[PDB]
Amino acid sequence: IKSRNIIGIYARGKEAEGAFVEAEKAFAQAEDWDNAVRLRIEKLNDLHGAYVIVRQTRSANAAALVAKKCTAQ
Numbered sequence: 025i026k027s028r029n030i031i032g033i034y035a036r037g038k039e040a041e042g043a044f045v046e047a048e049k050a051f052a053q054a055e056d057w058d059n060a061v062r063l064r065i066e067k068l069n070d071l072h073g074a075y076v077i078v079r080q081t082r083s084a085n086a087a088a089l090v091a092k093k094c095t096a097q
Contacts, residue, residue, distance in 0.1 A: 031056055057081060061089075 025031075031054050038047045051060055057077055064073045078086050 028054065028056060028058065032059070035059070061086060 035047060035050065035054075035056065038050070041047075051063075057080075061074065061077055064070045064077070074090060078090055
């Protein structure tokens, strides 16, 4: 399935199962960077990971958010 909107509701219930490793590997399996951008910064606290995601995606919104975060901090 290539529908990420389905996965966006599917993965929320996957946290209750307690399979953190399975959810983490399914995030890369589905390439769900949309939640990963927030999750790595908040839960994992990986600014270098955020830079890697920005380089892989080159999204204008992600670049603007990273610039705002760098200027604020």
